Design a binder for this molecule. Structure first.
Ligand SMILES: NC(=O)c1ccc[n+]([C@@H]2O[C@H](COP(=O)([O-])OP(=O)(O)OC[C@H]3O[C@@H](n4cnc5c(N)ncnc54)[C@H](O)[C@@H]3O)[C@@H](O)[C@H]2O)c1
Ligand SMILES: NC(=O)c1ccc[n+]([C@@H]2O[C@H](COP(=O)([O-])OP(=O)(O)OC[C@H]3O[C@@H](n4cnc5c(N)ncnc54)[C@H](O)[C@@H]3O)[C@@H](O)[C@H]2O)c1
Ligand SMILES: [Zn+2]
Ligand SMILES: [Zn+2]
Ligand SMILES: [Zn+2]
Ligand SMILES: [Zn+2]
Lengths: 377, 377
């Protein structure tokens, strides 16, 4: 390699402080250390988690940072000990890591690895506690263990899923978070049953992923709910048999859904991050056995509430992180399902744009006119 | 039978108004209308559910009425159409019905029959909207579908479980409420796996049934929590391995449990009815997969709260009504298990008194002098 062992200069989008546009300038990326992988991103998408940390909402937010966490790339070099991947391999960097040995990687019903989360959340690396980006000798900090807003990034060995070398990296960059989450929420968390009734709250990428997996699961009725009727026709494509605007009704949205279905829906998914809607989705879960899965991320410190009656009479409140998928073992599986023509992964992307335009991708987001925009360099 | 079709003059305990003593006088019990069943009560027990309504704290309350809902007895006569039982059958009248045909009886995960609840909730019979007790002509209303504080009572067919002729009626009366709830919380709602860790909050009858079942499910560790440490000996007898008093500790009780285990207990049970503890029980359920079952009924107007993060990071909130036991189907199955010699059911009875002393039995309940007090005629 020209590059291996050497630092690397490349074009990144740096966030200097919150609530403020991104600076597409140049960055130096250190060589990878023990148990690390330097990845060359080739495509990367925008997620609402990214705009949320840009808004000063994250308590653990650490500026300056390189945002970005939905991406695919190519291994460029690895540090010492790294036997899982080798330069040339095609990868998806995963904010949710996989160790194989900790308590949660072993339990069949979780994926909340504790391998490296102590450090990715502070923005640094495990080998020496310091980050790996630099701008004029001053450190830039990592976000969510990935930082896919640079041409090259360095990530923990536990965070790289190796994928089929023949998958289009400008499509499966979506499998690195948002779309996987909505899929797993149905398949792993809720385990949606054939013939069930589903109600999804919020028809963004995640929301539509839920609706997709719900059809693939045999849902006999999928109710979609958004305060944006211009999301309905795409939602009916992905499989929604019903579309509801809460503003079109007086009764609270929960009582509305309980009315169309008599008792509620077998499964309800909240893909917004609003605690009022969360409580609402629980309360239109079906009496006696309904499940509500909280998918979205709320403002830190904000609370959800309901009446204990809603659970003493049969509903179940749960959540999901990255759809419950065990990243490294199972993200290669999602690529495989993609490569068998089984998903609608292609329909999720609405805009391909170049990385110099990152800041206008954020304004196309903040207005909800796209679902997902893949950026290439 | 000398009493089929006639009214019966029997001894009973009438709640004339809230917050006064009951009156042990004679009452007139109509014969069973269609689909109804008249039952000679041979033993009956007290619950604090009876006290809370007698105390004037029920919004659903209706006076005068005849409380009592944990009993066992013998069919005296049956109304028109009734084939499931016959005179001489031994029965447990359950406050939770089983009709076999509503959409909750045909579902594996519920026991919340809707066939008669609209009429029992108002102390009447479904067949004509009216009660079946009278004094001097004026009507006395039912309680919970059962009204077991009377030598004879009239109940809905859907409410009558047919049990072994060899069970001692002065022990299985417990199976119509509190013990079943606690057991069913473990076996049906949580399904505690062998080897796992449990915390129980509240060491009354329900909480002890939770411990008992948790030991029998094979739980490696059972943590009992209560602010009255004088319940720790008996809790230990039922299979506990630790005892916590939240007042001994200078941090939130959910921190104590989460520190005694590394990440919380795999299952937690709230057996009090106190929404703050409800949240504590949820927040000390194991990260990633923990399950919290609300078993206690909160004061009306209270609300459970947590941060949505708690659910996203893998905890599941749920609850249970009568242990999710499909009453008429499975209460016979619990009576059979009892007689196999597999349960500690006899150990929940702390006193045996005469029906004339129902009021001293109610003063014992108010002080904790009493797990379950059983009355006979
Ligand atoms: N749990 C996880 O592992 C995980 C992973 C990825 C994303 N997320 C969270 O999922 C949420 C959604 O992800 P996205 O990328 O789909 O967001 P997105 O913003 O594309 O979708 C937002 C949708 O919410 C709708 N909405 C807003 N308020 C509403 C209301 N009151 N009633 C009905 N609809 C309403 C908007 O109209 C819009 O369509 C985000 O909060 C993100 O943080 C969670
Ligand atoms: N879900 C159902 O179908 C069903 C059926 C029957 C009863 N229940 C509910 O179960 C609950 C209890 O049943 P019981 O027979 O155990 O009642 P009980 O009153 O004997 O038990 C009360 C216990 O709670 C403990 N307690 C009170 N505040 C506490 C705190 N802050 N922290 C820790 N411990 C505390 C007391 O010390 C006492 O031991 C009731 O609220 C009742 O509504 C539910
Ligand atoms: Zn995301
Ligand atoms: Zn791990
Ligand atoms: Zn009771
Ligand atoms: Zn029914």
């Amino acid at each position: 390699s020209e590059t291996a062992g050497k630092p690397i200069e490349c074009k990144a989008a740096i966030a200097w402080e919150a609530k403020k546009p991104l600076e597409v300038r140049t960055v130096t990326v250190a060589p990878p250390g023990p148990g690390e992988v330097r990845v060359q991103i080739k495509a990367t998408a925008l997620c609402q988690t990214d705009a949320y940390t840009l808004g000063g909402l994250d308590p653990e937010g650490r500026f300056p940072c390189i945002l970005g966490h939905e991406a695919a790339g190519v291994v460029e070099s690895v540090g010492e000990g790294v036997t899982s991947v080798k330069p040339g391999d095609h990868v998806i960097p995963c904010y949710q890591a996989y160790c194989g040995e900790c308590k949660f990687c072993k339990h069949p019903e979780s994926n909340l690895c504790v391998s490296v989360r102590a450090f990715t959340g502070k923005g640094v690396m495990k080998s020496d506690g310091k980050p790996r980006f630099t701008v004029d000798g001053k450190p830039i900090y990592h976000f969510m263990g990935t930082s896919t807003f640079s041409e090259y990034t360095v990530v923990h060995e536990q965070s790289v899923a190796k994928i089929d070398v023949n998958a289009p990296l400008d499509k499966v960059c979506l499998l690195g978070c948002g779309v996987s989450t909505g899929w797993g929420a149905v398949f792993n968390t809720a385990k949606v049953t054939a013939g069930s009734t589903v109600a999804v709250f919020g028809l963004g990428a995640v929301g539509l992923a839920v609706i997709e997996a719900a059809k693939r699961a045999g849902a006999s009725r999928i109710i979609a709910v958004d305060i944006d009727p211009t999301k309905f026709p795409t939602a009916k494509e992905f499989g929604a048999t019903d579309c509801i605007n809460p503003k079109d009704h007086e009764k609270p949205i929960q009582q509305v859904i309980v009315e169309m279905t008599e008792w509620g829906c077998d499964y309800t998914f909240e893909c917004i991050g609003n605690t009022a809607v969360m409580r609402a989705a629980l309360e239109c879960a079906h009496r006696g056995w309904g499940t509500s899965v909280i998918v979205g991320v709320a403002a830190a410190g904000q609370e959800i509430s309901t009446r204990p009656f809603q659970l003493v009479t049969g509903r179940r409140w749960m959540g999901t992180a990255f759809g419950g998928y065990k990243s490294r073992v199972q993200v290669p599986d999602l690529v495989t399902d993609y490569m068998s023509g089984a998903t609608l992964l292609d329909k999720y992307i609405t805009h391909n744009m170049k990385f110099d335009q990152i800041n206008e991708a954020f304004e196309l987001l903040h207005a909800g006119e796209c679902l997902r925009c893949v950026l290439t360099f």
